[PDB]
Design a protein around this ligand. Structure first.
Ligand SMILES: *[C@H](C(=O)OCC)[C@@H](O)C(=O)N[C@@H](CC=C)C(=O)N[C@@H](CCCNC(=N)N)C(=O)N[C@@H](Cc1c[nH]c2ccccc12)C(N)=O
Ligand SMILES: [Ca+2]
Ligand SMILES: [Ca+2]
Length: 322
């Protein structure tokens, strides 16, 4: 059994709120500016000024904790520099077992609802249960930070809030290391690869990692400072964490081509080179591979050849589960 962060007891708090006819408000991470941040999201900042804390049950008639699965499309970054955390959550969803350790089953906005949710994280050398109230930062009725493509879905928003909580505030999340998020979801072992020095068996390493349900993400280090833009010529975002979500081989004009699939945690802004959703390359693979693999959609997720991936990106991080 997970130990209670700060002694806060999810089921006890929930049953007591329901008995008392109230919705939970979290003393440990209250719905006030200090839970947003301290500087950029401080009490005297532009960003903070627009923000009102509202429950999904105040936003919508039918809020849902999970809709059509807890899946990577549910992870669409908002106005916070927490790409590294969101990339890890999207990777997490590909491993159903570790997903539902972090995201306990049986949580909802209907029967037993008392405005409190909980998540489990690997923190302080312990698996910890973390509670949150479901007050969320909103502006003009819309979530400011993470949201799902499914606008009535709230699990990822609540998980991001619980992760903010353990780190002190949402602002505390602005900038970080994907592998740090991977570890907090697994207690696993992280390693990283310098892609300009990729071992010759790197594609097999990625294949095996994905098969065992390890978490993988990737990034392009901005080397000069940002002095060729943040967005590259072929629509990649530098210094930005992407989730690695698949690796598959296609037969391209009778020749095997190793592909890798990645996802921008923005849920949009995709690679425009070979194997991108609209690329010609797909005209030349057999129709069955093309239909299994290519999804023509602005969803943040796209394919690159492994060759192009290693030239464009600089760093792969892999968290292996023990
Ligand atoms: C995530 C993102 O939201 O993209 C925007 C939509 C992205 O900003 C991000 O966090 N990227 C990180 C890795 C993902 C690929 C990344 O490249 N760097 C952060 C981790 C480095 C941690 N610091 C360290 N090891 N010393 C990062 O940028 N961290 C901070 C940078 C920083 C450090 N000191 C600073 C002083 C002044 C200004 C910035 C400073 C940060 N807070 O951004
Ligand atoms: Ca979903
Ligand atoms: Ca796409």
């Amino acid at each position: 059994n997970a130990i209670k962060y700060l002694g806060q007891d999810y089921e006890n708090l929930r049953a007591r709120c329901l008995q008392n006819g109230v919705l939970f408000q979290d003393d440990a991470f209250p719905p006030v500016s200090h839970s947003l941040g301290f500087k950029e999201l401080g009490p005297n900042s532009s960003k903070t000024y627009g923000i009102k804390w509202k429950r999904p049950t105040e936003l919508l008639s039918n809020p849902q904790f999970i809709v059509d699965g807890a899946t990577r499309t549910d992870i669409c970054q908002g106005a916070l520099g927490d790409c590294w955390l969101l990339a890890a959550i999207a990777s997490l969803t590909l491993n159903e077992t570790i997903l539902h350790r972090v995201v306990p089953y049986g949580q909802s906005f209907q029967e037993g609802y008392a405005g409190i949710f909980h998540f489990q994280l690997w923190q302080f050398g312990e698996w910890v249960d973390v509670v949150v109230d479901d007050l969320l930062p909103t502006k003009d009725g819309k979530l400011v930070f993470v949201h799902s493509a499914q606008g009535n879905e709230f699990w990822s928003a609540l998980l991001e809030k619980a992760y903010a909580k353990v780190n002190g505030s949402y602002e505390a999340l602005s900038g970080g290391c994907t592998s740090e998020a991977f570890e907090d979801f697994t207690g696993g072992v992280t390693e990283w690869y310098d892609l300009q020095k990729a071992p010759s068996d790197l594609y097999q390493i990625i294949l095996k990692a994905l098969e065992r349900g390890s978490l993988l993400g990737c990034s392009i280090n901005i080397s000069d400072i940002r002095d060729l833009e943040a967005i590259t010529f072929k629509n990649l975002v530098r210094g930005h964490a992407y989730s690695v979500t698949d690796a598959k081989q296609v037969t391209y004009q009778g020749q095997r081509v190793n592909l890798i699939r990645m996802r921008n945690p923005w849920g949009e802004v995709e690679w425009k080179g070979p194997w991108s959703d609209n690329s010609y390359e797909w005209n030349k693979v057999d129709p069955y591979e093309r239909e299994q693999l290519r999804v023509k959609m602005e969803d943040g997720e796209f394919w690159m050849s492994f060759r192009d991936f290693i030239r464009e990106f600089t760093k792969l991080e892999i968290c292996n589960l023990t």
